C-alpha cells in the first residue's frame, strides 16, 4: 500500500511544511512513489479529462490522425508511434497562439495545440492547471525537505514547459502484454492519474542495485530490470494522484532521489490514464545542487526537443524543425547569458 499525503494549498516554509517535505523525500527513497489526496474539484476535473479522452478515442482514426501540428509536438500519436509501445496518446504541450512571440520567432516545439474540440480543450486545460498547482506545492516541499531555499526548484519552473500524455491502452489481444516497457522519465516531476482498470507498475529504490544516469548519452535506463522484482503495482485508488521523480530530479539531487522506473501492463480491457510532466522553463537549465564546481547542466528546452525529435523522426513537427533549421534558435537563446 502506497503512502498517501495531503498537500497544503500554500507552502510557506513553516515546520509542518519542512516535516512534510522530509516525509515526501523519505517516501520516494523507500517506495519510489507516493499518493497525494485530491479534493472534490481536483477529482472532478480528473474524471472529466478521462471522459473527454474516452470520447475522443472513439472518433474515427482519420479524424484522430488530423489532430497534429508541424509547430508543436502536441496532438495525436497512434499506437506504435512511441520495442514499440501500445497506447494511443494525445500530447498536450503549452498552448501558444501564432501571435505569441516565441511562435512568431519559430522556436522549436512552440505552437498551438491541435485540439479535437473545445470541450476537450477546456477539460484538459483546467485539469492541467490543477496539476500545475500541485506540482508547485511538491517542488517547494521537496526543496524544504532538502534544507534548500524554498524556491530552488520553482525558480526553474516559472512558465515551465509542463505537458501531459493523455493515454489509452488497448486491451490485451495476444500473449503480448507490454503496454509500455520499463523506462525512466526524462524530466523533472511526474504526476499521474488513472481510471479503475489497473496497469501501472513502478520500481522502488533497491539497496545495492546500480542505476544508470539516463540523461547521459552513454547510459540508458530503458529496459533495465524489466523482468526482475521488485515491481510495485500502482493499485487504482479513488481520490488520489501518484507522484514520482524523473531524470532531472535525480540529476539535480546527485542521486539522492532516483528517477523511478515505470512500465505499463495491458489489461484485459482498455485503460485510460493521464501522465502529467511538470518541467523547467524551456530556457532554464538544471544543475547539480549538492556538487558545486560541477559544470554539467541540462538545458531543458534542448533536452525536450532532442527527445521528441528522436522519438518521432518522421512527424511533420520534426521535418519542419529540420527544414527551417529551428534548432539554431536554441543556440541563439543562450548567447549573451551567464553560463
Ligand atoms: Ca541516455
Ligand atoms: Ni513516462
Spell out the domain ranges in the chain: 34-128+157-334
Query: What are 321's three cell numbers?
Result: 524543425
Q: How far apart are CA 171 and CA 262, in angstroms?
A: 19
Query: What are 215's three cell numbers?
Result: 540523461
Please report the DSSP string for 101-121 in residue order: HHHHTT-TT-B----S-HHHH
Task: Produce one character per residue of 145-158: b if its CB has 16 or more CB atoms within 10 Å, e if not.
Answer: bbebebebbbebbe
Q: How far apart are CA 338 and CA 109, in angstroms?
A: 24
CATH class of 34-128+157-334: mainly beta
Task: Report whether 250 contacts 213 (CB < 8 A).
Answer: yes
Q: From ligand 2's centre to the CA of 338, what distance in Å? A: 31
Task: Report whether 273 contacts 262 (CB < 8 A).
Answer: no
Listed in sequence order, the residues at least 6 apart from 256 whose beta carbon sits closer than 8 Å to its beta carbon are 25, 29, 146, 290
Q: What is the CA radius of gyration of the chain?
A: 19
**Which ligand minimizes its atom distance to the CA of 191?**
2
Task: Report whether 75 contacts 165 (CB < 8 A).
Answer: no
Residues with CB under 5 A from ligand 1 (ion): 214, 220
Q: From ligand 2's centre to the CA of 158, what distance in Å? A: 22
Q: What residue spans of the chain are helical by DSSP H?
A: 15-31, 40-57, 61-66, 101-104, 118-145, 247-252, 300-311, 316-323, 327-334
Paired with 274 in beta bridges are 166, 193
Q: How far apart are CA 288 and CA 298, in angstroms?
A: 10
Q: From ligand 1's centre to the CA of 18, what distance in Å? A: 33
Task: Report whether 104 contacts 117 (CB < 8 A).
Answer: no
* Determination technique used: X-ray
Nearest Cα to 243, choosing from 278, 269, 217, 218? 278
Task: Report whether 270 contacts 199 (CB < 8 A).
Answer: no
277: phi then psi, degrees, rounded to nearest 5: -115, 110
Structure resolution, Å: 1.6
Query: In the chain, what is the greatest distance between 2 CA atoms, to the nearest angstrom?
Result: 56
Tracing cell 498547482 back to the chain, one arrives at 133
Q: What Cα–Cα distance (Å) separates residue 319 from each residue in 84, 161, 163?
A: 21, 21, 21
Amino acid at each position: 500500500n502506497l503512502q498517501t499525503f495531503e498537500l497544503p494549498t500554500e507552502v510557506t516554509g513553516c515546520a509542518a511544511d519542512i516535516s512534510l517535505g522530509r516525509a515526501l523525500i523519505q517516501a520516494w527513497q523507500k517506495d519510489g512513489i507516493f499518493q497525494i489526496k485530491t479534493d472534490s474539484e481536483q477529482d472532478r476535473k480528473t474524471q472529466e479529462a478521462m471522459a473527454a479522452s474516452k470520447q475522443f478515442c472513439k472518433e474515427p482514426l482519420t479524424f484522430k490522425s488530423s489532430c497534429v501540428s508541424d509547430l508543436t509536438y502536441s496532438g495525436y500519436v497512434a499506437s506504435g508511434e512511441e520495442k514499440p509501445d501500445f497506447p494511443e496518446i494525445f500530447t498536450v504541450c503549452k498552448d501558444l497562439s501564432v501571435g505569441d512571440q516565441r511562435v512568431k520567432a519559430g522556436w522549436p516545439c512552440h505552437g498551438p495545440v491541435p485540439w479535437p474540440n473545445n470541450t476537450y480543450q477546456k477539460s484538459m486545460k483546467t485539469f492541467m492547471e490543477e496539476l500545475g498547482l500541485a506540482g508547485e506545492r511538491l517542488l517547494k516541499l521537496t526543496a524544504l525537505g532538502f534544507e534548500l531555499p524554498i524556491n530552488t526548484f520553482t525558480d526553474l519552473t516559472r512558465d515551465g514547459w509542463h505537458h501531459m500524455a493523455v493515454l489509452r491502452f488497448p486491451p490485451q489481444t495476444s500473449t503480448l502484454s507490454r503496454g509500455i516497457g520499463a523506462h525512466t522519465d526524462y524530466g523533472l516531476l511526474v504526476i499521474a492519474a488513472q481510471d479503475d482498470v489497473g496497469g501501472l507498475y513502478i520500481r522502488p529504490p533497491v539497496e545495492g542495485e546500480k542505476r544508470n544516469r539516463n540523461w547521459l548519452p552513454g547510459e540508458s535506463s530503458a529496459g533495465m530490470f524489466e523482468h526482475d522484482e521488485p515491481w510495485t503495482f500502482v493499485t487504482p485508488t479513488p481520490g488520489v494522484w501518484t507522484v514520482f521523480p524523473g531524470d532531472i530530479l535525480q540529476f539535480m539531487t546527485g542521486g539522492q532521489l532516483l528517477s523511478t522506473p515505470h512500465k505499463v501492463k495491458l489489461n484485459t480491457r482498455e485503460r485510460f490514464a493521464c501522465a502529467y510532466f511538470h518541467e523547467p522553463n524551456f530556457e532554464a537549465s538544471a544543475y547539480p545542487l549538492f556538487e558545486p564546481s560541477a559544470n554539467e547542466r541540462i538545458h531543458y528546452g534542448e533536452h525536450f526537443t532532442n527527445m521528441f525529435m528522436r522519438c518521432y523522426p518522421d512527424r511533420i513537427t520534426t521535418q519542419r524543425i529540420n527544414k527551417e533549421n529551428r534548432l539554431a534558435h536554441l543556440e541563439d537563446l543562450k548567447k549573451y547569458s551567464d553560463t
